[PDB]
């Protein structure tokens, strides 16, 4: 999941969370 917004990990593309724009390393 994204620590910054809660989005599911499958929402990450191109090095960023596609919802909130967090950097990839915010995924846990």
mmCIF file of N, CA, C and O in Angstrom:
data_model
loop_
_atom_site.group_PDB
_atom_site.id
_atom_site.type_symbol
_atom_site.label_atom_id
_atom_site.label_comp_id
_atom_site.label_asym_id
_atom_site.label_seq_id
_atom_site.Cartn_x
_atom_site.Cartn_y
_atom_site.Cartn_z
ATOM 1 N N UNK A 1 0.860 -1.199 0.000
ATOM 2 C CA UNK A 1 0.000 0.000 0.000
ATOM 3 C C UNK A 1 0.899 1.253 0.000
ATOM 4 O O UNK A 1 2.074 1.180 0.403
ATOM 5 N N UNK A 2 0.352 2.394 -0.420
ATOM 6 C CA UNK A 2 1.065 3.655 -0.315
ATOM 7 C C UNK A 2 0.917 4.215 1.087
ATOM 8 O O UNK A 2 -0.206 4.446 1.547
ATOM 9 N N UNK A 3 2.034 4.486 1.752
ATOM 10 C CA UNK A 3 1.934 5.066 3.084
ATOM 11 C C UNK A 3 1.341 6.460 3.088
ATOM 12 O O UNK A 3 0.786 6.864 4.113
ATOM 13 N N UNK A 4 1.459 7.210 1.982
ATOM 14 C CA UNK A 4 0.984 8.589 2.005
ATOM 15 C C UNK A 4 -0.527 8.704 1.800
ATOM 16 O O UNK A 4 -1.136 9.629 2.356
ATOM 17 N N UNK A 5 -1.143 7.831 0.986
ATOM 18 C CA UNK A 5 -2.582 7.971 0.729
ATOM 19 C C UNK A 5 -3.399 6.706 0.948
ATOM 20 O O UNK A 5 -4.630 6.791 0.977
ATOM 21 N N UNK A 6 -2.763 5.549 1.081
ATOM 22 C CA UNK A 6 -3.474 4.312 1.267
ATOM 23 C C UNK A 6 -3.766 3.505 0.012
ATOM 24 O O UNK A 6 -4.293 2.378 0.126
ATOM 25 N N UNK A 7 -3.431 4.021 -1.166
ATOM 26 C CA UNK A 7 -3.727 3.330 -2.416
ATOM 27 C C UNK A 7 -3.060 1.958 -2.439
ATOM 28 O O UNK A 7 -1.986 1.741 -1.860
ATOM 29 N N UNK A 8 -3.676 1.036 -3.164
ATOM 30 C CA UNK A 8 -3.102 -0.277 -3.313
ATOM 31 C C UNK A 8 -1.814 -0.183 -4.132
ATOM 32 O O UNK A 8 -1.727 0.636 -5.025
ATOM 33 N N UNK A 9 -0.813 -0.976 -3.768
ATOM 34 C CA UNK A 9 0.462 -1.016 -4.476
ATOM 35 C C UNK A 9 0.363 -1.136 -6.004
ATOM 36 O O UNK A 9 1.245 -0.748 -6.730
ATOM 37 N N UNK A 10 -0.726 -1.714 -6.492
ATOM 38 C CA UNK A 10 -0.883 -1.915 -7.922
ATOM 39 C C UNK A 10 -1.148 -0.598 -8.659
ATOM 40 O O UNK A 10 -1.224 -0.595 -9.893
ATOM 41 N N UNK A 11 -1.290 0.500 -7.910
ATOM 42 C CA UNK A 11 -1.505 1.838 -8.438
ATOM 43 C C UNK A 11 -0.211 2.592 -8.735
ATOM 44 O O UNK A 11 -0.250 3.789 -9.072
ATOM 45 N N UNK A 12 0.928 1.950 -8.609
ATOM 46 C CA UNK A 12 2.234 2.586 -8.789
ATOM 47 C C UNK A 12 2.719 2.350 -10.207
ATOM 48 O O UNK A 12 2.628 1.229 -10.732
ATOM 49 N N UNK A 13 3.206 3.398 -10.882
ATOM 50 C CA UNK A 13 3.744 3.285 -12.245
ATOM 51 C C UNK A 13 4.783 4.384 -12.414
ATOM 52 O O UNK A 13 4.577 5.479 -11.881
ATOM 53 N N UNK A 14 5.864 4.096 -13.116
ATOM 54 C CA UNK A 14 6.816 5.111 -13.492
ATOM 55 C C UNK A 14 7.559 5.737 -12.347
ATOM 56 O O UNK A 14 8.140 6.824 -12.507
ATOM 57 N N UNK A 15 7.600 5.053 -11.197
ATOM 58 C CA UNK A 15 8.331 5.494 -10.033
ATOM 59 C C UNK A 15 7.500 6.276 -9.037
ATOM 60 O O UNK A 15 8.063 6.816 -8.069
ATOM 61 N N UNK A 16 6.193 6.398 -9.267
ATOM 62 C CA UNK A 16 5.326 7.197 -8.426
ATOM 63 C C UNK A 16 3.991 6.497 -8.169
ATOM 64 O O UNK A 16 3.482 5.758 -9.027
ATOM 65 N N UNK A 17 3.417 6.764 -6.994
ATOM 66 C CA UNK A 17 2.003 6.474 -6.797
ATOM 67 C C UNK A 17 1.162 7.335 -7.738
ATOM 68 O O UNK A 17 1.233 8.581 -7.681
ATOM 69 N N UNK A 18 0.337 6.705 -8.575
ATOM 70 C CA UNK A 18 -0.444 7.463 -9.544
ATOM 71 C C UNK A 18 -1.623 8.189 -8.939
ATOM 72 O O UNK A 18 -2.246 8.993 -9.652
ATOM 73 N N UNK A 19 -1.922 7.969 -7.652
ATOM 74 C CA UNK A 19 -2.948 8.769 -6.989
ATOM 75 C C UNK A 19 -2.384 10.073 -6.419
ATOM 76 O O UNK A 19 -2.783 11.156 -6.826
ATOM 77 N N UNK A 20 -1.447 9.993 -5.468
ATOM 78 C CA UNK A 20 -1.001 11.169 -4.732
ATOM 79 C C UNK A 20 0.350 11.700 -5.191
ATOM 80 O O UNK A 20 0.785 12.747 -4.707
ATOM 81 N N UNK A 21 1.015 11.009 -6.114
ATOM 82 C CA UNK A 21 2.297 11.426 -6.630
ATOM 83 C C UNK A 21 3.478 11.104 -5.727
ATOM 84 O O UNK A 21 4.604 11.503 -6.042
ATOM 85 N N UNK A 22 3.277 10.367 -4.639
ATOM 86 C CA UNK A 22 4.390 9.983 -3.786
ATOM 87 C C UNK A 22 5.454 9.235 -4.587
ATOM 88 O O UNK A 22 5.164 8.454 -5.506
ATOM 89 N N UNK A 23 6.717 9.449 -4.187
ATOM 90 C CA UNK A 23 7.820 8.660 -4.707
ATOM 91 C C UNK A 23 7.608 7.184 -4.376
ATOM 92 O O UNK A 23 6.992 6.853 -3.347
ATOM 93 N N UNK A 24 8.223 6.320 -5.169
ATOM 94 C CA UNK A 24 8.056 4.882 -5.090
ATOM 95 C C UNK A 24 8.366 4.330 -3.694
ATOM 96 O O UNK A 24 7.788 3.343 -3.209
ATOM 97 N N UNK A 25 9.334 4.949 -2.984
ATOM 98 C CA UNK A 25 9.820 4.411 -1.693
ATOM 99 C C UNK A 25 8.773 4.642 -0.608
ATOM 100 O O UNK A 25 8.997 4.148 0.495
ATOM 101 N N UNK A 26 7.670 5.334 -0.894
ATOM 102 C CA UNK A 26 6.602 5.456 0.098
ATOM 103 C C UNK A 26 5.700 4.236 0.119
ATOM 104 O O UNK A 26 4.838 4.123 0.995
ATOM 105 N N UNK A 27 5.893 3.292 -0.796
ATOM 106 C CA UNK A 27 5.101 2.076 -0.799
ATOM 107 C C UNK A 27 5.671 1.128 0.234
ATOM 108 O O UNK A 27 6.899 0.911 0.304
ATOM 109 N N UNK A 28 4.774 0.498 0.975
ATOM 110 C CA UNK A 28 5.130 -0.479 1.993
ATOM 111 C C UNK A 28 4.320 -1.762 1.853
ATOM 112 O O UNK A 28 3.337 -1.819 1.139
#
